[PDB]
Design a protein around this ligand. Structure first.
Ligand SMILES: [Zn+2]
Ligand SMILES: [Zn+2]
Length: 69
């Protein structure tokens, strides 16, 4: 009949959690690191608990803390 061969378009590092390997699109808490990288607020505070440096940007992601332990 019977297409359309159809995309958004625009789908590059826009709203995509590369931690939990899934796209977001609507209402999600996003957080962007100081090293310019946007991720999901939950998963960034999962993978980057024990690590705190952009693997390419070479900037510390914890940018002050200011916790303890
Ligand atoms: Zn996620
Ligand atoms: Zn970065």
């Amino acid at each position: 009949m019977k297409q359309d061969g159809e995309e958004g378009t625009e789908e590059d590092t826009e709203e995509k959690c590369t931690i939990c390997l899934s796209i977001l699109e609507e209402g999600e808490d996003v957080r962007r690191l100081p090293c310019m990288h946007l991720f999901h607020q939950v998963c960034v505070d999962q993978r980057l608990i024990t690590n705190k440096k952009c693997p390419i940007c070479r900037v510390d992601i914890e940018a002050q803390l200011p916790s303890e332990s």
